[PDB]
Amino acid sequence: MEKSFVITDPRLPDNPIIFASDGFLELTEYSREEILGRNGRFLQGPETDQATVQKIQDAIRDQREITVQLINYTKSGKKFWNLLHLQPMRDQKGELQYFIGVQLDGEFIPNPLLAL
Numbered sequence: 001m002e003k004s005f006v007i008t009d010p011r012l013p014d015n016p017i018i019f020a021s022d023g024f025l026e027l028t029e030y031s032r033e034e035i036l037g038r039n040g041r042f043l044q045g046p047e048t049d050q051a052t053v054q055k056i057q058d059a060i061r062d063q064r065e066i067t068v069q070l071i072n073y074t075k076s077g078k079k080f081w082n083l084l085h086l087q088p089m090r091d092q093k094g095e096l097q098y099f100i101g102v103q104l105d106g107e108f109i110p111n112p113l114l115a116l
């Protein structure tokens, strides 16, 4: 699939998605029009590890890059492992301008090891 990413605007409330790639639409099965403005946690669901969610929240607060692997759900309810790479983007004035999150679909780290 084409590269899956979203870009959010941290200068607006709770990191709304302002751009979603064609690859993100294809991975997640959502249309662009129905994604724009939402927070990326819409992909989460029952099996998502809340301890991983909290690591993400802390990295965003700290404006630090992080990679986590977590369960996400397509629009039709199919589970997938998402290796999510979140990166703050600063402008030439040193000010936070975006976050970008790149999603790779796969159980890269086996769940029994992820859990240790």
Ligand SMILES: Cc1cc2nc3c(=O)[nH]c(=O)nc-3n(C[C@H](O)[C@H](O)[C@H](O)CO)c2cc1C
Pocket (backbone or CB within 6 Å): 006, 007, 008, 015, 039, 040, 041, 043, 044, 053, 054, 056, 057, 060, 070, 072, 082, 084, 086, 099, 100, 101, 102, 103
């Ligand atoms: C740019 C960006 C992309 C994100 N992409 C995802 C994602 O693909 N899946 C997910 O479960 N959370 C994602 N999140 C995390 C989610 O939006 C939220 O920050 C955490 O769930 C903590 O509330 C993303 C966050 C940002 C800022």
Ligand SMILES: [Cl-]
Pocket (backbone or CB within 6 Å): 056, 057, 060
């Ligand atoms: Cl957050």
Ligand SMILES: [Co+2]
Pocket (backbone or CB within 6 Å): 001, 002, 003
């Ligand atoms: Co591909």
